[PDB]
C-alpha cells in the first residue's frame, strides 16, 4: 500500500460514490515502512498530471505530514538540478512509504475499512 495509491482509491458505497463523497478517504496508519524503489523523475512528473493534488495533501496531513507544496509543482525539466530536492522528496513519500497496518475512514457513510499486511480491503 504505497501512499500514492491513496490518491487512486475511494469508498465503495454506492451512495458516497453517487454523491461525490467517496473520494478521498481519510487515512490513519498504525504501522508504516520504507521500501527501496528505483528513482524516476520523469515518471514522477508525469504522475503529477494524474493526481488530485487537493486529495494528496489531505491524506499526507491525516498521516501527519505538512512537508508538501501547497499546490501542484509546475515542472518541465525532470532532470533539472533545481527540482531534484523536491522530486527526491516526492519519490520518498509517494513511492517509498508503505502502509502495512492502518484504516481508511469514509466521512460520509461512516464506515472504516482496513489495511492489513499490506492490502487495503474495500468490502462491506
Amino acid at each position: 500500500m504505497k501512499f500514492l495509491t491513496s490518491n487512486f482509491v475511494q469508498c465503495a458505497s454506492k451512495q458516497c460514490v453517487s454523491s461525490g463523497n467517496a473520494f478521498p478517504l481519510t487515512f490513519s496508519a498504525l504501522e508504516m515502512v520504507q521500501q527501496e524503489a528505483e528513482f524516476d523523475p520523469e515518471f514522477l512528473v508525469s504522475m503529477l498530471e494524474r493526481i488530485d493534488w487537493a486529495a494528496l495533501v489531505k491524506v499526507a496531513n491525516d498521516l501527519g505530514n505538512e512537508s508538501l507544496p501547497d499546490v501542484k509543482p509546475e515542472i518541465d525539466e525532470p532532470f533539472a538540478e533545481g527540482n531534484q530536492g523536491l522530486l527526491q522528496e516526492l519519490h520518498s513519500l509517494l513511492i517509498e512509504t508503505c502502509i502495512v497496518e492502518g484504516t481508511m475512514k469514509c466521512e460520509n457513510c461512516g464506515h472504516t475499512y482496513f489495511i492489513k499486511n499490506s492490502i487495503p480491503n474495500f468490502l462491506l
Partner: protein, 184 residues
C-alpha cells in the same frame, strides 16, 4: 527478443504510453501487473486470497480487495483498464452490462479498455468444475459462467455508452478494446 507474437493482453499493455495509470479490475493473482514496468497499475479482485497471492508474488504490486462492479476505483482517473475473464461470471445480462459500465466509468475521455470473455463459439449459461478451499480441504464445486456469442460483448459495450475500437478472437475468447462514447 521475443519471437512468438504477443497475446492481446500483453500487446495492449505494452502499447500504453509511458507512465500511464491503469486499473486491473479483477486482477486475480496479478498475472498481468508486471507486463509493462513503465506503467502504474492498481489491481483489484473480489477474492481475498487471490489478492494476497498477488501481493506475496510481488510486493511492488499495488493490489486491493473490492467487488468488480461496486468497486473502489475513482471515476475518469485512468488511462486504461483491463478486465480479463471476469465479467463472464455475472449471471444476469443486467449485471454483465453494469460490469462493463463500471469498466468504462474508470476511464479518462481518451482512456481505453480491454475486455476479454469466454466465447460460446468455443446454451450460453454453463457450470464449470472449480476448486475452492473450505476448512483446509480443496473441494470441487461448480461456478457459473456466461459464454459470449459474436457481437454480444460489443452490444453490451454500446448499450453502456461505450464505443468499440477493435474486436478479435483468441483461444476460445472474445475480446474488445473499447472507450467511452463521444457523449458521456
Amino acid at each position: 527478443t521475443r519471437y512468438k507474437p504477443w497475446p492481446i493482453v500483453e500487446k495492449f499493455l505494452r502499447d500504453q504510453k509511458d507512465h500511464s495509470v491503469g486499473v486491473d479490475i479483477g486482477c486475480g493473482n496479478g498475472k498481468y501487473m508486471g507486463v509493462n514496468n513503465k506503467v502504474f497499475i492498481v489491481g483489484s479482485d473480489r477474492s481475498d486470497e487471490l489478492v494476497k497471492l498477488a501481493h506475496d508474488m510481488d510486493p511492488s504490486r499495488e493490489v486491493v480487495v473490492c467487488d468488480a462492479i461496486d468497486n473502489a476505483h475513482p471515476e475518469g482517473r485512468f488511462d486504461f483498464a483491463i478486465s480479463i475473464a471476469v465479467i463472464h461470471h455475472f449471471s444476469t445480462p443486467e449485471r454483465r452490462r453494469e460490469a462493463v459500465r463500471a469498466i468504462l466509468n474508470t476511464l479518462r475521455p481518451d482512456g481505453r479498455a480491454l475486455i476479454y470473455v469466454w466465447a460460446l463459439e468455443q446454451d450460453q449459461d454453463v457450470m464449470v468444475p472449480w476448486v475452492k478451499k473450505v476448512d483446509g480441504v480443496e473441494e470441487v464445486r461448480y461456478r457459473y459462467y456466461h459464454l459470449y456469442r459474436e457481437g454480444e460483448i460489443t452490444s453490451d459495450v454500446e448499450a453502456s455508452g461505450g464505443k468499440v475500437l477493435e474486436t478479435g478472437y483468441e483461444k476460445d475468447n472474445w475480446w474488445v478494446v473499447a472507450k467511452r462514447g463521444d457523449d458521456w
